[PDB]
Design a protein around this ligand. Structure first.
Ligand code: CA
Ligand code: CA
Lengths: 152, 152
DNA sequence: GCAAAACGACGTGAGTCAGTTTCG
DNA sequence: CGAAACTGACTCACGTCGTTTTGC
């Protein structure tokens, strides 16, 4: 559990509100109990000629990694534990994505419960819909309504 | 000559490195002694549905305004001296556009003498080429090069 | 004659997902 | 099984200028 400097968090919260992304997804995957994986992702996108900035975040956040997708690169942090510790500290400084940040935090906290019950998992999927709605979601396919139909 | 709150500046700098833009332009205009106006502009672009964020900036920076362009809107600050005061205080916290911010300040401090000497005017235009160089310039037409219309 | 506002647009540089695979 | 990586791409939401006009 790394403790982050407020100055670094204040700046990062602004950069995140600008070019960052707090994403919650429901991925159909037949190897999971309820046939769907609950995926959470903290992302920061930037032109690849500026990847040093993203490479810099890896070092300062102390976790995560950068992937190059061509003309653009992404800083990615998926690990649940480090994501919770990070978002807890960043959250109070966010202005545009504070809500989704808190929704993610809530989900990580209900993960073990979600795995125990179909109605809890369904409820959590509902947390996901709200995050998507808060974002500028444009190509979403799997919603909680998709997960419900899975019943029988 | 307002003094801004440190934390407000930390966040804004991040947001600026994210969705902002420090623009320097040489705009051809016959009413000017040297046939070109030196234009400087601080801009923050955002989806129109999130215009509220841009309106809040107007109040917190205490100068400037927001313009609508359809799906997107912009917070714009062109006033030379308030811009200088603003950038001076923001500059120390920028990480991706700190260079262009300093160039703009340097350009401002030098405006009064560039109008005096044709060669000074050209050197300062060099400053705007540099700023464009630092940004992700893609549709630029007027450079210190074209300003060699001075040779006459 | 120049500061500052108005108005418009190119070509991305992002955001926000989807789908498939890995392996403790 | 399930956390986390890996590979992929749609649809913009931006960035970064250009031209023209207002106005003291
Ligand atoms: Ca943005
Ligand atoms: Ca950006």
């Amino acid at each position: 559990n790394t403790k982050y400097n407020k100055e670094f968090l204040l700046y990062l919260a602004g950069f995140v509100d600008g070019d960052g992304s707090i994403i919650a997804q429901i991925a159909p995957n037949q190897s999971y109990k309820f046939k769907h994986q609950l995926s959470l992702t903290f992302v920061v996108t930037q032109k690849t000629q500026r990847r040093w900035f993203l490479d810099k975040l890896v070092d300062e956040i102390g976790v995560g990694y950068v992937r190059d997708r061509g003309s653009v690169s992404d800083y990615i942090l998926s690990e649940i534990k480090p994501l919770h510790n990070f978002l807890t500290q960043l959250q109070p400084f966010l202005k545009l994505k504070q809500k989704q940040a808190n929704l993610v935090l809530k989900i990580i906290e209900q993960l073990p419960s979600a795995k125990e019950s179909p109605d809890k998992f369904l409820e959590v999927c509902t947390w996901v819909d709200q995050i998507a709605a808060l974002n500028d979601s444009k190509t979403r396919k799997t919603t909680s309504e998709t997960v419900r139909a899975v019943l029988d």
